[PDB]
């Protein structure tokens, strides 16, 4: 719906339109905490991700997504198998991470 | 590899099957509650129709 | 090099998420989606009307 | 990597190999690049 400046504008408007938000008569305080979820993509577990994607969609699609994350990465003469953590370079990775982050939002 | 892979996998599978059973049981519970609500609505409509018939008989 | 060592450590030192933690995460997800009445996404049909788009 | 490497076993699967393959496919589902070194065959061989 919105560009990130409009997201910032709406966040300012929501803060301003909360109840009694600037009232500090009775000692109440307001806190904004901004933080970053550290190493989420790195620490995604592929079996658990398969279970959560199996919750929201068809099991063939979920199995495709996690099997797709289990690949061999190569760079020149180096190679290893990714077996832990997601690959952010897959086309559907933004979708998969927004769903995973929604579960983290629930937590 | 670790045996924690085996315990982790089996825990997730039993959690999935438990959730599926809970969803099935709850779906049957609101199915029966919908059945009883529909029957109560039918009885209410029958009572309203009987009242309308009595009013029509009194007016006639 | 660091990433190969991390992958190797995951195979050797097991899933870092405990099974209790995983079950709690899964249960929170099922309770949420059941509360939101979410319908799971189907596999795309042979004659899905939006496939071309 | 998938055919011509001399460490690739193209003989028929033994019963111990089949039991290991099914057991690991139950443990780490659809993770064939992870399963294959533990079984001892290629990922495509294990999947097929």
């Amino acid at each position: 719906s919105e560009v990130p400046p409009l997201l910032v504008y709406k966040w300012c408007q929501g803060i301003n339109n909360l109840d009694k938000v600037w009232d500090t008569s009775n000692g109440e305080c307001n806190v904004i905490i901004e933080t970053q979820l550290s190493k989420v993509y790195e620490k995604i577990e592929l079996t658990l991700l398969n279970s959560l994607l199996r919750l929201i969609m068809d099991h063939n699609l979920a199995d495709y997504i996690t099997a797709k994350n289990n690949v061999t990465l190569t760079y020149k003469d180096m190679s290893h198998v990714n077996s832990y953590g997601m690959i952010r370079g897959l086309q559907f990775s933004a979708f998969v991470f927004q769903y995973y982050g929604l579960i983290l939002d629930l937590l | 590899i670790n045996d924690k892979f085996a315990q982790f996998s089996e825990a997730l599978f039993m959690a999935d099957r438990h959730a599926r059973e809970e969803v099935r049981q709850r779906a049957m519970m609101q199915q029966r509650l919908a059945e009883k609500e529909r029957q109560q609505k039918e009885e209410h409509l029958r009572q309203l129709a009987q009242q309308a018939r009595a009013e029509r008989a009194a007016a006639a | 090099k660091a990433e190969q060592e991390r992958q190797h450590n995951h195979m050797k030192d097991g899933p870092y998420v405990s099974s209790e933690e995983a079950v709690a995460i899964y249960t929170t997800t099922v309770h949420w989606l059941e509360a939101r009445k979410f319908s799971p996404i189907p596999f795309p049909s042979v004659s899905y009307k939006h496939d071309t788009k | 990597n998938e055919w011509l490497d001399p460490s690739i076993k193209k003989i028929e699967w033994s019963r111990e190999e089949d039991e290991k393959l099914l057991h690991l496919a139950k443990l780490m589902p659809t993770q064939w690049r992870t399963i294959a070194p533990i079984v001892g065959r290629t990922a495509n061989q294990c999947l097929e």
Binding site: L55 | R20, R24 | - | -
Partner: peptide, 21 residues
């Protein structure tokens, strides 16, 4: 029974895990 099973939000019957010993 544990793989081709579809989502648990759809209800449905769990296929029997004929485990034995």
């Amino acid at each position: 029974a544990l793989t081709e099973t579809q989502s648990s939000l759809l209800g449905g019957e769990n296929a029997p895990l004929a485990e034995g010993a």
